[PDB]
Amino acid sequence: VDCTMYICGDSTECSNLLLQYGSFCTQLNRALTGIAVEQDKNTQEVFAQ
């Protein structure tokens, strides 16, 4: 999920303010990526032994 686009629809007026909350935008991607990365590790170890 792209925080920048989700929160602020395609508009810099909102995009500027989002910069003030810092990593809240990014670290979510890190969280979600953290999920989606291992989601294939699940299927990895379950099915391919």
């Binding site: 792209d2 920048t4 686009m5 395609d10 991607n29 990526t33």
Partner: protein, 45 residues
């Protein structure tokens, strides 16, 4: 597009793998505006 990922890892060493660089968007070409009668021919004429 390669240089923008190294700014995501903050490292000059980029480990073998796939990394997600900033998203891209398609941008708009143009704007499309799409929309009785008052008796001014009956008043003014």
């Amino acid at each position: 597009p390669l240089s923008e990922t190294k700014c995501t890892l903050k490292s000059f060493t980029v480990e073998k793998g796939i990394y997600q660089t900033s998203n891209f968007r398609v941008q708009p070409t143009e704007s499309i505006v799409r929309f009785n009668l008052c008796p001014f021919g009956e008043v003014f004429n």
